[PDB]
């Protein structure tokens, strides 16, 4: 993970029992941004015709 400045306080109820409030600086710095990789395969599937 990454080291982020944390606090323990309610903020208009945006930090409920199991919710976390994230600032906008985190989005700008591309923090926790991940990259997913997928694959697509195709076969010729030779037939009678």
């Amino acid at each position: 993970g990454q080291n982020m400045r944390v606090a323990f306080m309610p903020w208009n109820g945006y930090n409920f029992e199991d919710s976390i409030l994230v600032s906008e600086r985190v989005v700008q710095e591309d923090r926790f941004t991940t990259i997913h990789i997928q694959e697509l395969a195709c076969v010729s599937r030779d037939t009678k015709l």
């Binding site: 599937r45 030779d46 037939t47 009678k48 015709l49």
Partner: protein, 405 residues
């Protein structure tokens, strides 16, 4: 060489499916034992019939118009064309009352549905319907409409010069208007499902471990017919002796059938070794490197006769990493080569293929030129043989194959 042998012979001449057919079919006559729910997943594909039906519901028609339409869409095919006719639907509805324009009215609205131009009337009303669709701000809509209306017969000849003086058009400008018609892309029914399922003919297998591939038959395909040990012992203790004769007969025929079958298997394997011993060249290198083989050469290999092998190799398949091939495919004629040698027809066929594929597409090579080229390489063949090999490979034309340089 009586009846028993007679039947044993027809046993190997046929493919494996009809063999299993007769085997299993005759396995019911005499006691001789052979030996995540319901739906896998289940999915109901839509299709360009159900999709044309979907639209009908949404749209507002009356109770009578609805029937007509149902009937119309039944006539639609995979290609996209109403199959029968206009008046045909009127004659098939059995009611003389309903006018011929009645169907037209409905049919005039069903063909602006999803793919527009569906259910066209004889591969031409399509363009008319497809063209009327997009806006009138297109550059040469007039011209193209006029072309399509009565001047398609002329367009059929792939000729453009005649269209000027016929229908009072400009100088080649129409040509750009003729390209508009080419982009129309007819047959909007064929947006169909490309779900053609996969096919196979697996019979014997060849696999290349440590060089010198070994030939061995399929584990599942081959049928194993055993005898029952249970009913065997039951013959000695039989009472009326009628029973005993019955069981003796069943027993003797079973043994006979068993041996016959095995004989088939053994023969197949033997013939599956000779070829591999002779034609290692082909499995390694390709069709270009096949040696010629005849029935007489295979019979002479291992204590065999021509007649016998002739039957084994009919409708038999072999799977190798090269491909899937019939055994009859390996045998072919030969031609005289340089140095007294013999060259297989398949080598010449592959050579012709690769030579035509690598020739200059601008100006095509004549069969005489190909004959001369082959003679220069050291093959020594006639022009007729080249013509036949070219014609055999779904290539009738030699010089007519000319595209834009």
């Amino acid at each position: 060489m009586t009846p028993q042998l007679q039947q044993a012979i027809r046993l190997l001449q046929l493919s494996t499916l009809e063999l299993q057919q007769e085997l299993q079919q005759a396995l019911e006559s005499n006691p001789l034992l052979e030996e995540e729910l319901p739906v896998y997943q289940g999915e109901t594909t839509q299709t360009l019939q159900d999709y044309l039906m979907w639209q009908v519901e949404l749209t507002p028609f009356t109770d009578t118009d609805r029937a007509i339409a149902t009937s119309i869409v039944d006539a639609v095919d995979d290609t996209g064309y109403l199959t029968i006719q206009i008046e045909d639907i009127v004659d098939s509805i059995g009611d003389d009352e309903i006018g011929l324009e009645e169907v037209e009215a409905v049919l005039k609205r069903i063909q602006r549905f999803d793919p527009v131009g569906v259910a066209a009337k004889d591969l031409r009303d399509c363009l008319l319907i497809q063209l009327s669709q997009f806006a009138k701000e297109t550059p040469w809509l007039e011209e193209a409409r006029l072309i399509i209306s009565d001047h398609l017969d002329l367009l059929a000849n792939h000729d453009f010069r005649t269209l000027m003086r016929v229908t009072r058009l400009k100088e080649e400008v129409l040509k750009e208007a003729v390209n508009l018609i080419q982009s129309l892309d007819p047959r909007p029914g064929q947006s169909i499902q490309t779900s053609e399922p996969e096919y196979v003919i697996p019979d014997v297998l060849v696999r290349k471990v440590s060089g010198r591939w070994t030939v061995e038959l399929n584990a599942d395909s081959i049928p194993r017919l055993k005898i029952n040990q249970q009913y065997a012992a039951m013959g000695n203790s039989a009472r009326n002796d009628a029973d005993g004769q019955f069981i003796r007969s069943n027993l003797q025929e079973a043994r006979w059938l068993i041996k016959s079958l095995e004989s088939r298997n053994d023969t197949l394997l033997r013939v599956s070794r000779c070829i591999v011993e002779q034609q290692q060249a082909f499995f390694e290198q390709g069709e270009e490197y096949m040696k010629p083989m005849v029935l007489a050469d295979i019979a002479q290999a291992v204590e065999m006769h021509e007649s016998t092998i002739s039957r084994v190799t009919t409708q038999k398949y072999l799977h190798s990493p090269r491909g899937i091939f019939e055994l009859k495919y390996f045998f072919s004629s030969h031609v005289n080569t340089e140095g007294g040698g013999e060259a297989s027809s398949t080598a010449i066929r592959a050579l012709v293929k690769k030579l035509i594929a690598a020739e200059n597409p601008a100006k095509p090579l004549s069969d005489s030129k190909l004959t001369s080229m082959l003679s220069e390489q050291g093959i020594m063949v006639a022009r007729r043989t080249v013509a036949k090999y070219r014609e055999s490979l779904s290539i009738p034309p030699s010089n007519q194959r000319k595209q834009l340089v």
